[PDB]
Design a protein around this ligand. Structure first.
Ligand SMILES: *[C]C1=C([C])[C]=C2C(=[C]1)N([C][C]([O])[C]([O])[C]([O])[C]OP([O])(=O)OP([O])(=O)O[C][C]1O[C](N3[C]=NC4=C3N=[C]N=C4[N])[C]([O])[C]1[O])C1=NC(=O)[N]C(=O)C1=N2/[C]=[C]/[C][N][C]1[C][C]C2=C1[C]=[C][C]=[C]2
Ligand SMILES: *[C]C1=C([C])[C]=C2C(=[C]1)N([C][C]([O])[C]([O])[C]([O])[C]OP([O])(=O)OP([O])(=O)O[C][C]1O[C](N3[C]=NC4=C3N=[C]N=C4[N])[C]([O])[C]1[O])C1=NC(=O)[N]C(=O)C1=N2/[C]=[C]/[C][N][C]1[C][C]C2=C1[C]=[C][C]=[C]2
Lengths: 494, 499
């Protein structure tokens, strides 16, 4: 019934907000639609896998908030296997390599690839993390899809194929689906192309021992009966002194303030009184989430390591169901496994098949790419298609089609009377990630603390000390990387 | 409580569906979120205006279903004023003209304008009305915005400016917001560029005497207490023998079948058990409605007619708040008025102003365009910003961003167990319009009649006899219009003669 703050959503962001408020001495209630917490994180446990992350999993350097929260809850990380060689598979052939990006030998192709990554970062330096609509060329870049930008930038099919895979992998959407401004912002606010794409020293460096679902689970443990499961929120009424929040099972909650910690578009599932302001009313119809199936194939041994392959595969082309894999073996070296993502249109196309049919296609692909018959003998399989989830809408996160970010972007975290907005989509650093979920939940919690006169305005946004366990190495470039001409640049010189 | 069919939504589509089912002898209930029926149609009545349509208003030749339904309800149409000259206002100057499209004198610009409209229709002929995703180049066209297509097609700024206005006016969205495949489908399924853009012999030919809101109102009168107002649906449960539908005010309805007659994205406001299939789950998050403010400025007399202007203005340029107007004077010649649309980004930009501020900007624009000081002396003003509507989401209709129609289009009207889908967005002829609302509502109703074994399969889709009151003249082209080269076409001819 009555409390200080109702938090709508028991994902990492909602849980992080509720914990901060609880620790500050306020009475909080979390209303969660599902019969579990964690949202876009979900750790499955069974005897065959021990544990496996079927949603969000990876953490890395510069993601200090999620690392701090997890450590406080008694969790530890381990390093994703990147000891041996990575593989770039292109035109039916595997090319092993070391370093974050697959190397290029043809001189013209080299210039084109170098210019592509460089230009993504160059453009990003003009985009404010907390206000991408304030970029000098915001409208020009927002009125273009990533497909148009890539068609302009990439003088080789080689670069365009890799750039396309990069987009698909980052935001689980097609290049023609997404705004160029939004995508460039997205990469920039994760620290740039090297940081986002790297395993060692990047976003995919580590996973949590025992799974990421433990973050939301352990906060639920701390909050006790304050978390209400199977309470989908249906109605928010702000016409009176206290805010009224109603659930599908007909419970009524009364609070001074509300935190909305759900994907922006899932705000549509709530009927508002009074109606939302015009801009938010339309915004929440314009912001879909991507499409992905996360698939984990289990083997008797991590056989790829014997061939000096780490398990990372970057796989070009339409025919391949999975464009990117990582070794998912446990740190102890057992429960050998390969994790792959079926991305964007392929998630939609391949969903028509059976689980067994998808397993077969993945095994035959992996056998090809790894050059190993052992890939054809899986011992177990787990998968999750996030497109089917009513209370997620997709994964990993919300994307912005052309024209939307400039017109509606500023309303994302703008309070509506006594409703404040959390959720990873509202973060300014690693938005889209578990890190962004923590940032946004704590920031939204502090907005309410300020509204209550409990903290000053300059404490709403708070810096985070660097993790001592996962220190960040700086991102470096070489002289030649910085100064070598693009393809059209070289032609000008000629 | 218990009935044969629950219809969710009391707009024209839901009301047409409910009426058909009722007439067939079934027990129907209509659950409507608002304190009124009509949805994206709304006729305001007061002493200053008598009546005025603030939402959907125009009907025309080839829209035979809405015309038949309205006639059966005792309604009549009248012709929108197009006796005098139209105005094209470009680069701060007005150019009066006659005919549906502004004439072009520059031979190069002429070729470019002629090729633009022609090519829109050429491309449209490759797109099946009932399955646009089956077009031979569906993926190529769907992966492009209308902005990209226009940049490719238009060799003059003049053509590109007019083409941009055309898109904004048709679908209340920016050219960079919308799929080229979807937009080309949208125009084709209204009968093409001439039919959609025309007043005389097109979509803007007529309005209903007394307002379009009367269609939904008079059906409510026929259905009596079967229409439940202020019953927003929150929950649909199909796990049991009969379908359970719950409302926000905690009422429960039980039915054999359900018709969803709401904008596709507004399906998000309903919690489903079991969850929707994956494709529909995601589709309903990918399909926004456009942005528009409909504004009506009232004057003592229709003074523009005295200067041989009909009241139609096509107004190019960023500075102009309104890009298109029509005479909204009553057929009796009184309550003189100009209707204008504030479109797409301008609906968002200008919403920041007060009502009085918007009135002032419109009057000063109209004074300039009509060359008339009388435009600065309004007697009344009415407006409606559809962007603010929780139970509409926007107007006129739903648009598809790049990539969506080919991936998700086929699920739009695919039944989900015992839920069938009406609403104008699911129509195949004048989708987006009141006509499409009628087509989709009656089609969805007949899908259920077939499911009940009451009619054969071949009766689900039904042709409509042409109106005797609003006959359709065919769309014609001239020999030169058909065969004159494009700009690049002419350049090829110059290339070959020089080679
Ligand atoms: C799904 C997914 C996947 C598959 C994967 C991934 C992911 C995901 N990611 C993302 C994450 O997870 C996120 O971000 C988070 O989680 C979010 O959080 P938040 O914000 O909190 O949200 P959520 O979860 O959703 O929650 C919400 C809640 O609420 C609820 N609801 C709803 N509605 C409602 C409710 N309640 C009441 N009422 C109502 N009405 C729900 O239910 C929930 O619970 C991620 N992240 C990270 O960090 N990491 C990771 O890993 C991840 N993942 C992914 C990744 C990938 N990566 C890749 C590889 C290579 C590369 C890449 C990228 C880039 C570059 C390279
Ligand atoms: C808004 C608007 C405006 C401003 C204008 C216009 C329009 C609109 N349009 C469109 C129409 O209106 C439509 O289509 C119709 O109406 C639709 O119907 P339906 O489908 O039925 O839908 P609605 O209405 O929306 O209804 C629904 C219902 O439901 C309900 N709900 C929700 N949710 C819910 C519910 N319930 C229960 N529960 C729940 N959850 C709601 O409330 C409702 O009621 C149009 N159309 C026609 O036909 N006409 C006209 O006029 C119109 N408009 C416009 C036009 C324009 N035009 C222009 C001029 C020149 C040109 C153009 C275009 C093109 C070219 C040229």
């Amino acid at each position: 019934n009555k409390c200080d703050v109702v938090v709508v959503g028991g994902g990492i962001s909602g849980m992080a907000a509720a914990k901060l408020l609880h620790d500050s001495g306020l009475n909080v209630v979390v209303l969660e639609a599902r019969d579990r917490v964690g949202g876009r994180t979900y750790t499955l446990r069974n005897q065959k896998v021990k544990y496996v992350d079927l949603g969000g999993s990876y953490v890395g350097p510069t993601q200090n908030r999620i690392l701090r929260l997890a450590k406080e809850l008694g969790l530890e990380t381990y390093k994703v296997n990147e000891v041996e060689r990575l593989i770039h598979h292109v035109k039916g052939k595997s090319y092993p390599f070391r370093g974050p990006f697959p190397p290029v030998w043809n001189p013209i192709t080299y210039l084109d690839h170098n210019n592509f990554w460089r230009t993504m970062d160059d453009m990003g330096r003009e985009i404010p993390s907390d206000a991408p609509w304030k970029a000098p060329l915001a409208e020009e870049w927002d009125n273009m899809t990533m497909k148009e930008l890539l068609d302009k930038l990439c003088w080789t099919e080689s670069a365009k194929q890799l750039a396309t895979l990069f987009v698909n992998l980052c935001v689980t959407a097609e290049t023609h689906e997404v705004s160029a401004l939004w995508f460039l912002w997205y990469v920039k606010q994760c620290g740039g192309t090297t940081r986002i794409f790297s395993t060692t020293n990047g976003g995919q460096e580590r996973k949590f021992v025992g799974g990421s679902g433990q973050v939301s689970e352990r906060i639920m443990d701390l909050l006790g009966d304050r978390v209400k499961l199977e309470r989908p929120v249906i109605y928010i009424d702000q016409t009176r002194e206290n805010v009224l929040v109603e659930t599908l099972n007909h419970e009524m909650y009364e609070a001074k303030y509300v935190i909305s910690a759900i994907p922006p578009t899932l705000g549509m599932k709530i009927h508002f009184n009074p109606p939302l302001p015009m801009m938010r009313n339309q915004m929440i119809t314009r912001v879909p989430l991507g499409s992905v199936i996360k698939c984990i194939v289990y083997y008797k041994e991590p056989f790829w390591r014997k061939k000096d392959y780490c398990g990372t595969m970057i796989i070009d082309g339409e025919e391949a169901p999975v464009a990117y894999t990582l070794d998912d073996t446990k740190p102890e070296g057992n429960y050998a496994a390969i994790m792959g993502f079926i991305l964007a249109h392929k998630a939609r196309k391949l969903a028509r098949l059976t689980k067994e049919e998808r397993l077969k296609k993945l095994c035959e692909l992996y056998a090809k790419v790894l050059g190993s018959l052992e890939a054809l003998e899986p011992v177990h399989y787990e998968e999750k298609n996030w497109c089917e989830e009513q209370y997620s809408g997709g994964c990993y996160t919300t994307y912005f089609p052309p024209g939307i970010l400039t017109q509606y972007g500023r309303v994302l975290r703008q309070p509506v009377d006594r409703i404040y907005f959390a959720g990873t989509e509202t973060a300014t650093h690693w938005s889209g990630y578990m890190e962004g979920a923590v940032e946004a939940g704590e920031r939204a919690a502090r907005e309410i603390l300020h509204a209550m006169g409990k903290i000053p305005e300059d404490e709403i946004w708070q810096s985070e000390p660097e993790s001592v366990d996962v220190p960040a190495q700086p991102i470096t470039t070489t002289f030649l990387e910085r100064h070598l001409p693009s393809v059209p640049g070289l032609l000008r010189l000629i």
